[PDB]
Amino acid sequence: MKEKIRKKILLAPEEPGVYIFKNKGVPIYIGKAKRLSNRLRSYLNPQTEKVFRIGEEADELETIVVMNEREAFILEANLIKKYRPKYAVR
Ligand SMILES: [Mn+2]
Ligand SMILES: [Mn+2]
Ligand SMILES: [Mn+2]
């Protein structure tokens, strides 16, 4: 995983949000979190091959802090529909 992505993961706040792993400007995975910190840190110790892939293929990680879990739910759904990320279940 790119050092800058590890750094961003370790700096992520204990706040609700949506996260987007990207490669060459294209989202490859979009997820939500009740706490960005907790969820993103799970990528550092990959529990599945897909999680390993997402973290190795990405060249960028974007995070969006949201108002609350309801916003996270709908923002995530909308972004997945918009971008159809390669690692999103279809
Ligand atoms: Mn999700
Ligand atoms: Mn960007
Ligand atoms: Mn709420």
Swiss-Prot record:
Residues 14-89 form the GIY-YIG domain. It is found in: Cytoplasm. Belongs to the UvrC family. The UvrABC repair system catalyzes the recognition and processing of DNA lesions. UvrC both incises the 5' and 3' sides of the lesion. The N-terminal half is responsible for the 3' incision and the C-terminal half is responsible for the 5' incision. Interacts with UvrB in an incision complex. This is UvrABC system protein C. It comes from Thermotoga maritima (strain ATCC 43589 / DSM 3109 / JCM 10099 / NBRC 100826 / MSB8). The chain holds residues 1 to 90 of 557 of the full protein.
